């Protein structure tokens, strides 16, 4: 029944004033992309930064199992778009946020499916 909860441990660490995980790999790009959350190539819009996926994954970075059967990673080999205002902590942003399964945008940072 025991299972290390790295996600909760990092969130609690940030709450205690801990410095965010560094060396997330920021990519050079046009900043004229679709703005979707996780893409095959950098898709940052003017309000985002694109990062190499593996470098923004808590599980990849901490060398721990991915939390799901088969231990698949949704970020490795892809690019994650992070709002520029949250680009100081890409790992924390990916852990605390959810991707819309319909438009592929971050809920609260691009997804407009809930609008009239």
């Amino acid at each position: 029944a025991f299972a290390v909860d790295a996600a909760k441990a990092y969130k609690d660490y940030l709450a205690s004033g801990g410095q965010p995980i560094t060396n997330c790999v920021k990519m050079l790009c046009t900043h004229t992309g679709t703005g979707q959350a996780i893409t095959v190539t950098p898709e940052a819009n003017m309000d985002q930064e694109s990062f190499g996926g593996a470098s923004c994954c808590l599980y990849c970075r901490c060398h721990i199992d991915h939390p799901n059967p088969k231990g698949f990673c949704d970020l490795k080999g892809k690019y994650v778009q992070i709002p520029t205002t949250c680009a100081n902590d890409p790992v924390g942003f990916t852990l605390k946020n959810t991707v819309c399964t319909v438009c592929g945008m971050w809920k609260g940072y691009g997804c407009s499916c809930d609008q009239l």
Binding site: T30, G52, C57
Partner: protein, 299 residues
């Protein structure tokens, strides 16, 4: 200011390759200076971006399911900035394998950890990138001789596992170089030593072999060519520049769907060598890509 400042970097001019200089110490006028990188961009993202921007100007063969292997992909950061740039640059569907002596997290399709000499592959490759380097090779208190170590492996890997028509980009410095690797540059349709504009204050260069012919088209003396390289660097200050990093609109390598054929050595005629030399052909089996790292068992 300099016209070269708007390019991704500077390639060794042809007349410098034709000299017979003696090896001198590398003394860069701009040594110690650092280029101003775009905010939050790592030096190695900038460096690989400029290398890829330059490779875009060459006749690289780019087949479907292109096979790319990247040596020295790790870093003291535990991540692979160069692999992230190669993954961005290469066409979707390209198989990308990377490797390093030390553990690291990667965006490559597969990563092998261990000395490069332990890396074996059943398949041939279309592009080999190496950033392998040991800063301890820089010793100004002893003669600057041709280095073995990982260079011995890279020379054998090119001769045994690079597809005809394939290309290479191998990082060298004043002290991290190999005479046999320069000699092998003569086995390509074209070659150069490329200096990124962001790292122009370093003796670093990428030795680029473009379109492998599997035989010598020109005889190169490696000790003389490294001396020629240092002479060029010593007499041609390169202005540090990040300018090319701001326009990524034409960055992606275009998928050319270059033909892949499995021809025997007896079928490689002058017409085939011409197609290879123009980046219009890749010669290798198109079987499954299988890789492995040898593990020494002891106690």
């Amino acid at each position: 200011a300099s016209s070269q400042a708007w390019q991704p970097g500077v390639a060794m001019p042809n007349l410098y390759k034709m000299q017979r200089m003696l090896l001198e110490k590398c003394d860069l006028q701009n040594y110690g200076d650092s280029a101003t990188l775009p905010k939050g961009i790592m030096m190695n993202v900038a460096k690989y971006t400029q290398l890829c921007q330059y490779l875009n100007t060459l006749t690289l063969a780019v087949p479907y399911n292109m096979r790319v292997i990247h040596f020295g992909a790790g870093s003291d950061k535990g991540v692979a900035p160069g692999t992230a740039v190669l993954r961005q640059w290469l066409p979707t569907g390209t198989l990308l394998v990377d490797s390093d002596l030390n553990d690291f997290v990667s965006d490559a399709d597969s990563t092998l950890i261990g000395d490069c000499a332990t890396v074996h592959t059943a398949n041939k490759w279309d592009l080999i990138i190496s950033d392998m380097y040991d800063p301890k090779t820089k010793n100004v208190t002893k003669e600057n001789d041709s280095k073995e170590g990982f260079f011995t492996y890279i020379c054998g890997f090119i001769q045994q596992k690079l597809a005809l028509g394939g290309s290479v980009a191998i990082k060298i410095t004043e002290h991290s170089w190999n005479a046999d690797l320069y000699k092998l540059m003569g086995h390509f349709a074209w070659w150069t030593a490329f200096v990124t504009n962001v790292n122009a204050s370093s003796s670093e260069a990428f030795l680029i072999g473009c379109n492998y012919l599997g035989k010598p088209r020109e005889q190169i003396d490696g000790y003389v060519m490294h001396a020629n390289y240092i002479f060029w660097r010593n007499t041609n200050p390169i202005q540090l520049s990040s300018y090319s990093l701001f326009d990524m609109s034409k960055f992606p390598l275009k998928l050319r769907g270059t033909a892949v054929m499995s021809l025997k050595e007896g079928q490689i005629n002058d017409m085939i060598l011409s197609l290879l030399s123009k980046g219009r052909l890749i010669i290798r089996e198109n079987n499954r890509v299988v890789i492995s790292s040898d593990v020494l068992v002891n106690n």
